[PDB]
């Protein structure tokens, strides 16, 4: 199988930037190289085929170049809609094979998270369970660290974290962190703190409640 290697796994570029994404084939593929764009919802579109030919309806800001083993997709000026993962595909020898993809995120100015903390609902408590939820919404950059403190002590156990993909309109991220406890354990402590470190804050960003 021809191995297709995308030189870069993930890229961060600003609005209007010229951006290029590259691919190397393990053997000459004679310009039979196509570029696909996959969105986080699973949508896949063709952008460029036969190295440099623009697919109908694709904006002229997309172009491609290359020969032999080495090929590149260029976006002349990055736009909001370009957040996606970009994959190359050779079709010169059987079987068709794809590169590993290059994720493209937009680089933008800092955005501090809006943090909300939620005690267990009365419904879940009457079921023996207690999940405490912290949402950290519309922040940038994506690197954020969340620690749960129960009465001052970190609790690594029982935490589930989930990040969104980059927002298609404002280029931020959001994250949900859930701390799940037994009801009895939840009722045995008082202060519940979702603590977050991020580029936008000197000290940890703290959202807390006292189990009243």
């Amino acid at each position: 199988d021809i191995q297709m290697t995308q030189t870069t796994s993930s890229l961060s570029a600003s609005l209007g930037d010229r951006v290029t994404i590259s691919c190397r084939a393990s053997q000459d593929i004679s310009n039979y190289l196509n570029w696909y764009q996959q969105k986080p919802d699973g949508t896949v579109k063709l952008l460029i085929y036969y190295t440099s030919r623009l697919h109908s309806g694709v904006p002229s800001r997309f172009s491609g170049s290359g020969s032999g083993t080495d090929y590149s997709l260029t976006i002349s000026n990055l736009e909001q809609e370009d957040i996606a993962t970009y994959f190359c595909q050779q079709g010169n020898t059987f079987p068709p094979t794809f590169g590993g993809g290059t994720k493209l995120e937009i680089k933008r100015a800092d955005a501090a998270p809006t943090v909300s903390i939620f005690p267990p609902s009365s419904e879940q408590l009457t079921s023996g369970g207690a999940s405490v939820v912290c949402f950290l919404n519309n922040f940038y950059p994506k690197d954020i660290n969340v620690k749960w403190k129960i009465d001052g002590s970190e609790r690594q156990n029982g935490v589930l974290n989930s990040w969104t993909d980059q927002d298609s309109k404002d280029s931020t991220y959001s994250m949900s962190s859930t701390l799940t406890l037994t009801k009895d354990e939840y009722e045995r402590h008082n202060s519940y703190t979702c603590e977050a470190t991020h580029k936008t804050s000197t000290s940890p960003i703290v959202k807390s409640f006292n189990r009243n």
């Binding site: 063709l46 794809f98 919404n137 990040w163 949900s176």
Partner: protein, 212 residues
């Protein structure tokens, strides 16, 4: 215009078989072939096979003992079937139209396939009201299987302020959350309700967010 519409998500048990239908619009199977490709966590995009206009097929040699593609020109449907699935067959299976050769110009939306013996489990749906300028409410969808759930707010009329987080899997059950943020004056005055469906369990629930 051109559309390829794939059947919905599927759960298959290990060693059982997977069947996906692709129904095409805007073109005929007399005039175009259909390729099948999948994307797994462990291998990226993998081309699986193609059925040409005349009915013949070519398969990725790694799957030939396990995979059959067939079609019905009169129905504009292509059928993908793969036997003896294991855990690492979990992924997103796409069909796509080659405009010519290996240039796939239009893609199905993908079919997410989970290969697992875990038991189908309805979620618990918990309203997240604030601790007692903007207010954020949430909805915790806890302990379901398989993917997916659908979640909306005020039956989809509330969207711009919504973040729904990719589900997180632990101990064979999924947990998903969603937050919605509104101006502080509009809730609890105006009503906000979480609508959750888990098709695999025929679960359909509304949880109004009530102040604590």
């Amino acid at each position: 215009d051109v559309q390829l519409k794939q059947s919905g998500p599927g759960l298959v048990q290990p060693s059982q078989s997977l069947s996906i239908t692709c129904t095409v619009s805007g073109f005929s199977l007399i005039d175009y072939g259909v390729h099948w490709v999948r994307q797994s966590p462990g291998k990226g995009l993998e081309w699986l096979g193609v059925i040409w206009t005349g009915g013949s097929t070519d398969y990725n040699a790694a799957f030939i003992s396990r995979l059959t593609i067939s079609k019905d020109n009169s129905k504009s449907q292509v059928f993908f079937k793969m036997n003896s699935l294991q855990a690492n067959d979990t992924g997103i299976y796409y069909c796509g139209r080659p405009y010519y050769g290996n240039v796939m110009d239009y893609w199905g939306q993908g079919t997410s396939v989970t290969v697992s013996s875990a038991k189908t489990t309805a979620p618990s749906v918990y309203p997240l009201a604030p601790v007692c300028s903007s207010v954020t409410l949430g909805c915790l969808v806890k302990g379901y299987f398989p993917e997916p759930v659908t979640l909306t707010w005020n039956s989809g009329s509330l969207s711009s302020g919504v973040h729904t987080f990719p589900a997180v899997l632990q101990s064979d059950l999924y947990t998903l959350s969603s937050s919605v943020t509104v101006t502080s004056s509009t809730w609890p005055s105006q009503s906000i309700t979480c609508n959750v469906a888990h098709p695999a369990s025929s679960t359909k629930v509304d949880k109004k967010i009530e102040p604590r």
